[PDB]
């Protein structure tokens, strides 16, 4: 039994998942997020209570307004860096792709559906057919090159073109489609199979820019994905998941939204620590 597995049983048998989450809530440091509250940036924020911190926000270089609701989450101890962001709005899709270009991002991890429970959580920022998607404000175009449809996720191969310079890069768009907002995946196997699919593409390696992780607000499901991956990388080199989460929350507010998402993170980390990947793929029923 590992130290993490010992802590998991103590939390479960004593039902301390909710006070542990409250502890993380109470220990979460607040940081200035003034730029996000500028009046000119109102139409760039999906939610009024979810903002990037000033010290860690991703800046749109050379634009008139450099603001995008996106946070660079660095974990120097893991040699890992992610960009967590909200689901783009119709008017910020151009900024989203400008950020992907400037940050040399190779993968976009999307953990939400476009519509969830009668509500639009994200604009359609990539094309679903062979028609080019134009973003004239920032000078980019996106084409759908290929798509690999699994039972609970789809991988879209996208071509991101700088329409001014002509340069193109290939973007891997990993779309998790069965993860409800404020909820959890179906099982640790399905989540880990998806995560290792992202890992196996090489898009998280240091020879690429930071991956862009997003859901609706960019804190809940996105926080779960990044917490498990960061803890798995560290466990490779004893980890304190609580401290890892608190340190990650210094870069973006509110990561992990429910005690159940915290509990699931523990389960995914414990199951991911055994790495079995073929076993996960079969349990996930991806095909």
PDB file of C-alpha atoms in Angstrom:
ATOM      1  CA  UNK A   1       0.000   0.000   0.000  1.00  0.00           C
ATOM      2  CA  UNK A   2       1.351   3.388  -1.073  1.00  0.00           C
ATOM      3  CA  UNK A   3       1.229   6.596   0.949  1.00  0.00           C
ATOM      4  CA  UNK A   4      -1.356   7.928  -1.510  1.00  0.00           C
ATOM      5  CA  UNK A   5      -3.438   4.750  -1.215  1.00  0.00           C
ATOM      6  CA  UNK A   6      -3.220   4.989   2.605  1.00  0.00           C
ATOM      7  CA  UNK A   7      -4.497   8.594   2.506  1.00  0.00           C
ATOM      8  CA  UNK A   8      -7.290   7.623   0.106  1.00  0.00           C
ATOM      9  CA  UNK A   9      -8.734   4.988   2.445  1.00  0.00           C
ATOM     10  CA  UNK A  10      -8.507   7.314   5.459  1.00  0.00           C
ATOM     11  CA  UNK A  11     -10.477   9.964   3.566  1.00  0.00           C
ATOM     12  CA  UNK A  12     -13.082   7.476   2.314  1.00  0.00           C
ATOM     13  CA  UNK A  13     -13.727   5.541   5.523  1.00  0.00           C
ATOM     14  CA  UNK A  14     -13.925   8.736   7.609  1.00  0.00           C
ATOM     15  CA  UNK A  15     -15.808  10.729   4.923  1.00  0.00           C
ATOM     16  CA  UNK A  16     -13.289  13.599   5.005  1.00  0.00           C
ATOM     17  CA  UNK A  17     -13.405  14.454   1.287  1.00  0.00           C
ATOM     18  CA  UNK A  18     -15.637  17.491   1.838  1.00  0.00           C
ATOM     19  CA  UNK A  19     -13.617  19.073   4.700  1.00  0.00           C
ATOM     20  CA  UNK A  20     -10.414  18.352   2.757  1.00  0.00           C
ATOM     21  CA  UNK A  21     -11.886  20.280  -0.179  1.00  0.00           C
ATOM     22  CA  UNK A  22     -12.932  23.066   2.195  1.00  0.00           C
ATOM     23  CA  UNK A  23      -9.376  23.078   3.565  1.00  0.00           C
ATOM     24  CA  UNK A  24      -8.070  23.549   0.020  1.00  0.00           C
ATOM     25  CA  UNK A  25     -10.693  26.264  -0.477  1.00  0.00           C
ATOM     26  CA  UNK A  26      -9.660  28.014   2.744  1.00  0.00           C
ATOM     27  CA  UNK A  27      -5.919  27.641   2.075  1.00  0.00           C
ATOM     28  CA  UNK A  28      -6.218  28.938  -1.504  1.00  0.00           C
ATOM     29  CA  UNK A  29      -4.342  32.228  -1.821  1.00  0.00           C
ATOM     30  CA  UNK A  30      -6.050  35.088  -3.642  1.00  0.00           C
ATOM     31  CA  UNK A  31      -4.006  37.028  -6.184  1.00  0.00           C
ATOM     32  CA  UNK A  32      -4.712  40.249  -8.094  1.00  0.00           C
ATOM     33  CA  UNK A  33      -6.736  39.841 -11.279  1.00  0.00           C
ATOM     34  CA  UNK A  34      -7.212  43.499 -12.184  1.00  0.00           C
ATOM     35  CA  UNK A  35      -6.780  43.277 -15.963  1.00  0.00           C
ATOM     36  CA  UNK A  36      -9.640  40.773 -16.208  1.00  0.00           C
ATOM     37  CA  UNK A  37     -11.936  43.326 -14.523  1.00  0.00           C
ATOM     38  CA  UNK A  38     -11.096  46.186 -16.900  1.00  0.00           C
ATOM     39  CA  UNK A  39     -14.347  47.438 -18.498  1.00  0.00           C
ATOM     40  CA  UNK A  40     -12.974  46.805 -21.994  1.00  0.00           C
ATOM     41  CA  UNK A  41     -12.494  43.109 -21.123  1.00  0.00           C
ATOM     42  CA  UNK A  42     -16.077  42.420 -20.015  1.00  0.00           C
ATOM     43  CA  UNK A  43     -16.999  40.809 -23.349  1.00  0.00           C
ATOM     44  CA  UNK A  44     -13.868  38.610 -23.175  1.00  0.00           C
ATOM     45  CA  UNK A  45     -14.868  36.770 -19.969  1.00  0.00           C
ATOM     46  CA  UNK A  46     -17.348  33.895 -20.059  1.00  0.00           C
ATOM     47  CA  UNK A  47     -17.962  34.043 -16.290  1.00  0.00           C
ATOM     48  CA  UNK A  48     -17.713  37.035 -13.965  1.00  0.00           C
ATOM     49  CA  UNK A  49     -16.321  34.927 -11.096  1.00  0.00           C
ATOM     50  CA  UNK A  50     -13.599  33.136 -13.115  1.00  0.00           C
ATOM     51  CA  UNK A  51     -10.611  35.334 -13.996  1.00  0.00           C
ATOM     52  CA  UNK A  52      -6.909  34.768 -14.637  1.00  0.00           C
ATOM     53  CA  UNK A  53      -4.449  36.232 -12.173  1.00  0.00           C
ATOM     54  CA  UNK A  54      -2.408  39.193 -13.397  1.00  0.00           C
ATOM     55  CA  UNK A  55       0.931  37.508 -12.671  1.00  0.00           C
ATOM     56  CA  UNK A  56       0.196  34.302 -14.639  1.00  0.00           C
ATOM     57  CA  UNK A  57      -2.193  35.363 -17.415  1.00  0.00           C
ATOM     58  CA  UNK A  58      -1.269  34.665 -21.025  1.00  0.00           C
ATOM     59  CA  UNK A  59      -0.764  37.895 -22.967  1.00  0.00           C
ATOM     60  CA  UNK A  60      -1.682  38.318 -26.633  1.00  0.00           C
ATOM     61  CA  UNK A  61       1.533  39.843 -27.966  1.00  0.00           C
ATOM     62  CA  UNK A  62       1.320  43.005 -30.130  1.00  0.00           C
ATOM     63  CA  UNK A  63      -2.491  43.100 -30.100  1.00  0.00           C
ATOM     64  CA  UNK A  64      -4.317  46.313 -29.213  1.00  0.00           C
ATOM     65  CA  UNK A  65      -5.829  44.512 -26.212  1.00  0.00           C
ATOM     66  CA  UNK A  66      -3.568  41.724 -24.950  1.00  0.00           C
ATOM     67  CA  UNK A  67      -6.183  40.184 -22.639  1.00  0.00           C
ATOM     68  CA  UNK A  68      -7.460  36.629 -22.918  1.00  0.00           C
ATOM     69  CA  UNK A  69      -8.999  34.618 -20.064  1.00  0.00           C
ATOM     70  CA  UNK A  70      -6.122  32.135 -19.953  1.00  0.00           C
ATOM     71  CA  UNK A  71      -3.510  31.225 -17.327  1.00  0.00           C
ATOM     72  CA  UNK A  72      -0.045  29.715 -17.729  1.00  0.00           C
ATOM     73  CA  UNK A  73       0.268  27.040 -15.026  1.00  0.00           C
ATOM     74  CA  UNK A  74       3.950  26.238 -14.412  1.00  0.00           C
ATOM     75  CA  UNK A  75       5.197  23.283 -12.358  1.00  0.00           C
ATOM     76  CA  UNK A  76       8.990  23.630 -12.511  1.00  0.00           C
ATOM     77  CA  UNK A  77       9.513  20.495 -10.398  1.00  0.00           C
ATOM     78  CA  UNK A  78       7.737  18.427 -13.083  1.00  0.00           C
ATOM     79  CA  UNK A  79       9.152  20.261 -16.135  1.00  0.00           C
ATOM     80  CA  UNK A  80       5.471  20.658 -17.038  1.00  0.00           C
ATOM     81  CA  UNK A  81       3.600  23.770 -18.137  1.00  0.00           C
ATOM     82  CA  UNK A  82      -0.033  24.040 -19.218  1.00  0.00           C
ATOM     83  CA  UNK A  83      -2.255  26.859 -20.413  1.00  0.00           C
ATOM     84  CA  UNK A  84      -5.705  26.647 -18.831  1.00  0.00           C
ATOM     85  CA  UNK A  85      -8.406  28.759 -20.447  1.00  0.00           C
ATOM     86  CA  UNK A  86     -12.160  29.152 -20.723  1.00  0.00           C
ATOM     87  CA  UNK A  87     -14.251  27.925 -23.608  1.00  0.00           C
ATOM     88  CA  UNK A  88     -13.760  30.638 -26.225  1.00  0.00           C
ATOM     89  CA  UNK A  89     -16.578  33.076 -26.908  1.00  0.00           C
ATOM     90  CA  UNK A  90     -17.586  33.903 -30.502  1.00  0.00           C
ATOM     91  CA  UNK A  91     -15.552  37.127 -30.288  1.00  0.00           C
ATOM     92  CA  UNK A  92     -12.489  35.564 -28.601  1.00  0.00           C
ATOM     93  CA  UNK A  93     -12.008  32.595 -30.952  1.00  0.00           C
ATOM     94  CA  UNK A  94      -9.533  34.743 -32.888  1.00  0.00           C
ATOM     95  CA  UNK A  95      -7.641  35.455 -29.656  1.00  0.00           C
ATOM     96  CA  UNK A  96      -7.686  31.752 -28.746  1.00  0.00           C
ATOM     97  CA  UNK A  97      -5.937  30.806 -31.987  1.00  0.00           C
ATOM     98  CA  UNK A  98      -3.566  33.778 -31.776  1.00  0.00           C
ATOM     99  CA  UNK A  99      -2.517  32.464 -28.362  1.00  0.00           C
ATOM    100  CA  UNK A 100      -2.073  28.915 -29.696  1.00  0.00           C
ATOM    101  CA  UNK A 101       0.190  30.251 -32.449  1.00  0.00           C
ATOM    102  CA  UNK A 102       2.293  32.553 -30.259  1.00  0.00           C
ATOM    103  CA  UNK A 103       2.774  29.957 -27.509  1.00  0.00           C
ATOM    104  CA  UNK A 104       3.835  27.265 -30.042  1.00  0.00           C
ATOM    105  CA  UNK A 105       1.102  25.028 -28.639  1.00  0.00           C
ATOM    106  CA  UNK A 106       0.857  21.561 -30.190  1.00  0.00           C
ATOM    107  CA  UNK A 107      -2.230  20.128 -28.450  1.00  0.00           C
ATOM    108  CA  UNK A 108      -5.622  21.500 -27.464  1.00  0.00           C
ATOM    109  CA  UNK A 109      -7.388  19.382 -24.833  1.00  0.00           C
ATOM    110  CA  UNK A 110     -11.133  20.112 -24.808  1.00  0.00           C
ATOM    111  CA  UNK A 111     -13.032  18.454 -21.954  1.00  0.00           C
ATOM    112  CA  UNK A 112     -16.516  19.878 -22.615  1.00  0.00           C
ATOM    113  CA  UNK A 113     -19.258  19.626 -25.191  1.00  0.00           C
ATOM    114  CA  UNK A 114     -20.227  22.747 -27.127  1.00  0.00           C
ATOM    115  CA  UNK A 115     -23.680  22.624 -25.502  1.00  0.00           C
ATOM    116  CA  UNK A 116     -24.352  21.098 -22.077  1.00  0.00           C
ATOM    117  CA  UNK A 117     -27.755  21.102 -20.336  1.00  0.00           C
ATOM    118  CA  UNK A 118     -29.435  23.649 -22.638  1.00  0.00           C
ATOM    119  CA  UNK A 119     -26.438  26.012 -22.324  1.00  0.00           C
ATOM    120  CA  UNK A 120     -23.679  26.893 -24.774  1.00  0.00           C
ATOM    121  CA  UNK A 121     -20.390  26.360 -22.940  1.00  0.00           C
ATOM    122  CA  UNK A 122     -18.000  27.070 -25.825  1.00  0.00           C
ATOM    123  CA  UNK A 123     -18.133  28.533 -29.314  1.00  0.00           C
ATOM    124  CA  UNK A 124     -17.500  26.342 -32.341  1.00  0.00           C
ATOM    125  CA  UNK A 125     -13.886  27.462 -32.806  1.00  0.00           C
ATOM    126  CA  UNK A 126     -12.857  24.697 -35.243  1.00  0.00           C
ATOM    127  CA  UNK A 127     -14.579  23.612 -38.471  1.00  0.00           C
ATOM    128  CA  UNK A 128     -16.648  20.436 -38.511  1.00  0.00           C
ATOM    129  CA  UNK A 129     -16.370  19.925 -42.286  1.00  0.00           C
ATOM    130  CA  UNK A 130     -14.063  20.893 -45.164  1.00  0.00           C
ATOM    131  CA  UNK A 131     -14.986  24.591 -45.104  1.00  0.00           C
ATOM    132  CA  UNK A 132     -12.202  26.859 -43.882  1.00  0.00           C
ATOM    133  CA  UNK A 133     -12.833  28.734 -40.627  1.00  0.00           C
ATOM    134  CA  UNK A 134     -11.569  32.316 -40.870  1.00  0.00           C
ATOM    135  CA  UNK A 135     -10.502  34.567 -37.974  1.00  0.00           C
ATOM    136  CA  UNK A 136      -9.804  37.911 -39.637  1.00  0.00           C
ATOM    137  CA  UNK A 137      -9.152  39.936 -36.467  1.00  0.00           C
ATOM    138  CA  UNK A 138      -5.922  38.039 -35.736  1.00  0.00           C
ATOM    139  CA  UNK A 139      -5.202  36.745 -39.250  1.00  0.00           C
ATOM    140  CA  UNK A 140      -5.620  32.996 -38.837  1.00  0.00           C
ATOM    141  CA  UNK A 141      -7.529  30.183 -40.512  1.00  0.00           C
ATOM    142  CA  UNK A 142      -8.316  26.675 -39.286  1.00  0.00           C
ATOM    143  CA  UNK A 143      -9.011  23.609 -41.434  1.00  0.00           C
ATOM    144  CA  UNK A 144     -10.177  20.155 -40.357  1.00  0.00           C
ATOM    145  CA  UNK A 145      -7.626  17.679 -41.720  1.00  0.00           C
ATOM    146  CA  UNK A 146      -8.839  14.433 -40.144  1.00  0.00           C
ATOM    147  CA  UNK A 147     -10.817  13.150 -37.195  1.00  0.00           C
ATOM    148  CA  UNK A 148     -10.598   9.913 -35.208  1.00  0.00           C
ATOM    149  CA  UNK A 149     -13.914   9.189 -33.492  1.00  0.00           C
ATOM    150  CA  UNK A 150     -13.890   6.967 -30.415  1.00  0.00           C
ATOM    151  CA  UNK A 151     -16.827   6.074 -28.184  1.00  0.00           C
ATOM    152  CA  UNK A 152     -16.247   8.805 -25.579  1.00  0.00           C
ATOM    153  CA  UNK A 153     -13.742  11.128 -27.269  1.00  0.00           C
ATOM    154  CA  UNK A 154     -12.677  12.379 -30.688  1.00  0.00           C
ATOM    155  CA  UNK A 155      -9.264  13.526 -31.919  1.00  0.00           C
ATOM    156  CA  UNK A 156      -9.405  16.188 -34.643  1.00  0.00           C
ATOM    157  CA  UNK A 157      -6.314  16.921 -36.720  1.00  0.00           C
ATOM    158  CA  UNK A 158      -6.368  20.660 -37.417  1.00  0.00           C
ATOM    159  CA  UNK A 159      -4.297  22.918 -39.669  1.00  0.00           C
ATOM    160  CA  UNK A 160      -3.625  26.336 -38.122  1.00  0.00           C
ATOM    161  CA  UNK A 161      -2.562  28.784 -40.839  1.00  0.00           C
ATOM    162  CA  UNK A 162      -1.135  32.266 -40.396  1.00  0.00           C
ATOM    163  CA  UNK A 163      -2.977  33.800 -43.340  1.00  0.00           C
ATOM    164  CA  UNK A 164      -0.539  36.724 -43.465  1.00  0.00           C
ATOM    165  CA  UNK A 165       2.723  34.741 -43.488  1.00  0.00           C
ATOM    166  CA  UNK A 166       1.361  31.507 -44.977  1.00  0.00           C
ATOM    167  CA  UNK A 167       3.030  29.353 -42.320  1.00  0.00           C
ATOM    168  CA  UNK A 168       0.974  26.395 -41.095  1.00  0.00           C
ATOM    169  CA  UNK A 169       1.202  24.113 -38.077  1.00  0.00           C
ATOM    170  CA  UNK A 170      -0.648  20.901 -37.311  1.00  0.00           C
ATOM    171  CA  UNK A 171      -2.733  21.020 -34.112  1.00  0.00           C
ATOM    172  CA  UNK A 172      -3.938  17.906 -32.288  1.00  0.00           C
ATOM    173  CA  UNK A 173      -7.407  18.600 -30.843  1.00  0.00           C
ATOM    174  CA  UNK A 174      -8.344  16.031 -28.180  1.00  0.00           C
ATOM    175  CA  UNK A 175     -12.079  16.313 -27.479  1.00  0.00           C
ATOM    176  CA  UNK A 176     -13.468  14.536 -24.409  1.00  0.00           C
ATOM    177  CA  UNK A 177     -17.221  14.410 -25.009  1.00  0.00           C
ATOM    178  CA  UNK A 178     -18.664  12.442 -22.045  1.00  0.00           C
ATOM    179  CA  UNK A 179     -17.444  14.536 -19.088  1.00  0.00           C
ATOM    180  CA  UNK A 180     -20.329  16.515 -17.545  1.00  0.00           C
ATOM    181  CA  UNK A 181     -19.733  19.997 -16.194  1.00  0.00           C
ATOM    182  CA  UNK A 182     -19.207  20.024 -12.416  1.00  0.00           C
ATOM    183  CA  UNK A 183     -18.932  16.242 -12.764  1.00  0.00           C
ATOM    184  CA  UNK A 184     -16.500  13.347 -13.151  1.00  0.00           C
ATOM    185  CA  UNK A 185     -15.503  10.962 -15.948  1.00  0.00           C
ATOM    186  CA  UNK A 186     -17.113   7.545 -16.201  1.00  0.00           C
ATOM    187  CA  UNK A 187     -14.162   5.754 -14.577  1.00  0.00           C
ATOM    188  CA  UNK A 188     -10.438   6.203 -13.909  1.00  0.00           C
ATOM    189  CA  UNK A 189      -9.736   3.887 -16.856  1.00  0.00           C
ATOM    190  CA  UNK A 190     -11.560   6.028 -19.428  1.00  0.00           C
ATOM    191  CA  UNK A 191      -9.891   9.200 -18.162  1.00  0.00           C
ATOM    192  CA  UNK A 192      -6.428   7.627 -18.019  1.00  0.00           C
ATOM    193  CA  UNK A 193      -6.839   6.111 -21.487  1.00  0.00           C
ATOM    194  CA  UNK A 194      -7.643   9.595 -22.803  1.00  0.00           C
ATOM    195  CA  UNK A 195      -4.771  11.206 -20.874  1.00  0.00           C
ATOM    196  CA  UNK A 196      -2.218   8.676 -22.105  1.00  0.00           C
ATOM    197  CA  UNK A 197      -3.549   9.122 -25.639  1.00  0.00           C
ATOM    198  CA  UNK A 198      -2.616  12.794 -25.268  1.00  0.00           C
ATOM    199  CA  UNK A 199       0.744  11.811 -23.749  1.00  0.00           C
ATOM    200  CA  UNK A 200       1.500   9.243 -26.464  1.00  0.00           C
ATOM    201  CA  UNK A 201       1.118  11.913 -29.160  1.00  0.00           C
ATOM    202  CA  UNK A 202       4.214  13.637 -27.762  1.00  0.00           C
ATOM    203  CA  UNK A 203       2.332  16.940 -27.554  1.00  0.00           C
ATOM    204  CA  UNK A 204       3.198  17.409 -23.854  1.00  0.00           C
ATOM    205  CA  UNK A 205       6.964  16.987 -24.303  1.00  0.00           C
ATOM    206  CA  UNK A 206       9.415  19.856 -23.656  1.00  0.00           C
ATOM    207  CA  UNK A 207      10.131  20.120 -27.405  1.00  0.00           C
ATOM    208  CA  UNK A 208       6.701  21.757 -27.833  1.00  0.00           C
ATOM    209  CA  UNK A 209       4.951  24.763 -26.360  1.00  0.00           C
ATOM    210  CA  UNK A 210       2.453  24.389 -23.520  1.00  0.00           C
ATOM    211  CA  UNK A 211      -0.701  22.447 -24.254  1.00  0.00           C
ATOM    212  CA  UNK A 212      -3.953  24.400 -24.069  1.00  0.00           C
ATOM    213  CA  UNK A 213      -6.439  22.770 -21.680  1.00  0.00           C
ATOM    214  CA  UNK A 214      -9.988  24.088 -21.620  1.00  0.00           C
ATOM    215  CA  UNK A 215     -13.510  23.165 -20.579  1.00  0.00           C
ATOM    216  CA  UNK A 216     -16.306  25.630 -19.821  1.00  0.00           C
ATOM    217  CA  UNK A 217     -14.658  27.907 -17.248  1.00  0.00           C
ATOM    218  CA  UNK A 218     -11.206  26.329 -17.487  1.00  0.00           C
ATOM    219  CA  UNK A 219     -10.972  25.398 -13.800  1.00  0.00           C
ATOM    220  CA  UNK A 220     -13.093  22.325 -13.096  1.00  0.00           C
ATOM    221  CA  UNK A 221     -12.547  19.487 -15.541  1.00  0.00           C
ATOM    222  CA  UNK A 222      -9.430  21.300 -16.777  1.00  0.00           C
ATOM    223  CA  UNK A 223      -8.118  21.368 -13.212  1.00  0.00           C
ATOM    224  CA  UNK A 224      -8.769  17.640 -12.826  1.00  0.00           C
ATOM    225  CA  UNK A 225      -6.917  16.775 -16.040  1.00  0.00           C
ATOM    226  CA  UNK A 226      -3.885  18.914 -15.192  1.00  0.00           C
ATOM    227  CA  UNK A 227      -3.706  17.762 -11.562  1.00  0.00           C
ATOM    228  CA  UNK A 228      -3.620  14.060 -12.451  1.00  0.00           C
ATOM    229  CA  UNK A 229      -1.052  14.544 -15.228  1.00  0.00           C
ATOM    230  CA  UNK A 230       1.207  16.712 -13.055  1.00  0.00           C
ATOM    231  CA  UNK A 231       1.059  14.300 -10.120  1.00  0.00           C
ATOM    232  CA  UNK A 232       1.764  11.324 -12.417  1.00  0.00           C
ATOM    233  CA  UNK A 233       4.879  13.090 -13.825  1.00  0.00           C
ATOM    234  CA  UNK A 234       6.117  13.924 -10.306  1.00  0.00           C
ATOM    235  CA  UNK A 235       5.391  10.389  -9.007  1.00  0.00           C
ATOM    236  CA  UNK A 236       7.776   9.202 -11.747  1.00  0.00           C
ATOM    237  CA  UNK A 237      10.823  11.112 -10.389  1.00  0.00           C
ATOM    238  CA  UNK A 238       6.181  10.747  -2.317  1.00  0.00           C
ATOM    239  CA  UNK A 239       3.861  13.521  -3.558  1.00  0.00           C
ATOM    240  CA  UNK A 240       1.384  15.635  -1.555  1.00  0.00           C
ATOM    241  CA  UNK A 241      -1.633  15.969  -3.920  1.00  0.00           C
ATOM    242  CA  UNK A 242      -3.074  18.669  -1.662  1.00  0.00           C
ATOM    243  CA  UNK A 243       0.062  20.811  -1.917  1.00  0.00           C
ATOM    244  CA  UNK A 244       0.368  20.156  -5.656  1.00  0.00           C
ATOM    245  CA  UNK A 245      -3.209  21.385  -6.132  1.00  0.00           C
ATOM    246  CA  UNK A 246      -2.670  24.437  -3.921  1.00  0.00           C
ATOM    247  CA  UNK A 247       0.511  25.305  -5.828  1.00  0.00           C
ATOM    248  CA  UNK A 248      -1.351  24.931  -9.126  1.00  0.00           C
ATOM    249  CA  UNK A 249      -4.110  27.195  -7.775  1.00  0.00           C
ATOM    250  CA  UNK A 250      -1.523  29.963  -7.380  1.00  0.00           C
ATOM    251  CA  UNK A 251      -1.538  30.139 -11.201  1.00  0.00           C
ATOM    252  CA  UNK A 252      -5.311  29.930 -11.792  1.00  0.00           C
ATOM    253  CA  UNK A 253      -8.174  30.254  -9.312  1.00  0.00           C
ATOM    254  CA  UNK A 254     -10.558  27.498  -8.329  1.00  0.00           C
ATOM    255  CA  UNK A 255      -8.960  24.424  -9.915  1.00  0.00           C
ATOM    256  CA  UNK A 256     -11.090  21.373  -9.031  1.00  0.00           C
ATOM    257  CA  UNK A 257     -14.668  22.539  -8.453  1.00  0.00           C
ATOM    258  CA  UNK A 258     -16.229  19.749  -6.357  1.00  0.00           C
ATOM    259  CA  UNK A 259     -15.084  17.296  -3.678  1.00  0.00           C
ATOM    260  CA  UNK A 260     -16.013  14.505  -6.102  1.00  0.00           C
ATOM    261  CA  UNK A 261     -13.591  15.861  -8.704  1.00  0.00           C
ATOM    262  CA  UNK A 262     -10.919  15.870  -5.992  1.00  0.00           C
ATOM    263  CA  UNK A 263     -11.749  12.282  -5.024  1.00  0.00           C
ATOM    264  CA  UNK A 264     -11.668  11.228  -8.682  1.00  0.00           C
ATOM    265  CA  UNK A 265      -8.268  12.883  -9.116  1.00  0.00           C
ATOM    266  CA  UNK A 266      -6.971  10.715  -6.263  1.00  0.00           C
ATOM    267  CA  UNK A 267      -8.416   7.594  -7.901  1.00  0.00           C
ATOM    268  CA  UNK A 268      -6.980   8.429 -11.323  1.00  0.00           C
ATOM    269  CA  UNK A 269      -3.574   9.175  -9.788  1.00  0.00           C
ATOM    270  CA  UNK A 270      -3.555   5.900  -7.834  1.00  0.00           C
ATOM    271  CA  UNK A 271      -4.620   3.899 -10.892  1.00  0.00           C
ATOM    272  CA  UNK A 272      -2.272   5.837 -13.170  1.00  0.00           C
ATOM    273  CA  UNK A 273       0.644   5.194 -10.812  1.00  0.00           C
ATOM    274  CA  UNK A 274       0.703   1.518 -11.837  1.00  0.00           C
ATOM    275  CA  UNK A 275       2.021   2.594 -15.253  1.00  0.00           C
ATOM    276  CA  UNK A 276      -1.733  -1.513 -18.060  1.00  0.00           C
ATOM    277  CA  UNK A 277      -2.475   1.096 -20.727  1.00  0.00           C
ATOM    278  CA  UNK A 278      -3.922  -1.659 -22.918  1.00  0.00           C
ATOM    279  CA  UNK A 279      -6.131  -2.690 -19.994  1.00  0.00           C
ATOM    280  CA  UNK A 280      -7.428   0.881 -19.681  1.00  0.00           C
ATOM    281  CA  UNK A 281      -8.237   1.025 -23.400  1.00  0.00           C
ATOM    282  CA  UNK A 282     -10.368  -2.122 -23.156  1.00  0.00           C
ATOM    283  CA  UNK A 283     -12.155  -0.960 -19.997  1.00  0.00           C
ATOM    284  CA  UNK A 284     -12.736   2.434 -21.625  1.00  0.00           C
ATOM    285  CA  UNK A 285     -14.551   0.678 -24.517  1.00  0.00           C
ATOM    286  CA  UNK A 286     -13.128   3.335 -26.834  1.00  0.00           C
ATOM    287  CA  UNK A 287     -13.729   1.169 -29.920  1.00  0.00           C
TER     288      UNK A 287
END
